[PDB]
Design a protein around this ligand. Sequence first.
Ligand code: ZN
Length: 165
Amino acid sequence: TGRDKNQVEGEVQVVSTATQSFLATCVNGVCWTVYHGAGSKTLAGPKGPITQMYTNVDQDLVGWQAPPGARSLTPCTCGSSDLYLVTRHADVIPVRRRGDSRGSLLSPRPVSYLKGSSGGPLLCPSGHAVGIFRAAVCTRGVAKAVDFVPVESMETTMRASKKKK
Ligand SMILES: [Zn+2]
């Protein structure tokens, strides 16, 4: 079976497999995450498997539908670039946008801590999704910058995954 005690109603949602749990953000009503270890079989939800809809390993994204009262964010459109990498356990860290789909950590943080929170939606001040935490440009165990995909490209990712016909 697979009935993990999830907790929707917030902003991010995690998953679980024989290894650990990843992080995923409900943007536009679709919890986005990386295929690094989300499982290719029938994923698990708080009360039923999660129907697969969007999933394209690296250089793309994986966003399933979040209908369990999931809070859907939106595309960024701020004026500054101060974000807050939100992890999946009430732990956000300020970021400084450094380039397209990337930001800078403003505090020596161990990259190992970043491992597991992949999907952390970057949010400028309080709301407006910017992108998720795909990876973290880090030095020996310490993370210095962020590897994040904007939440606008995720919209493009759907064109790749249709399966409608
Ligand atoms: Zn923004």
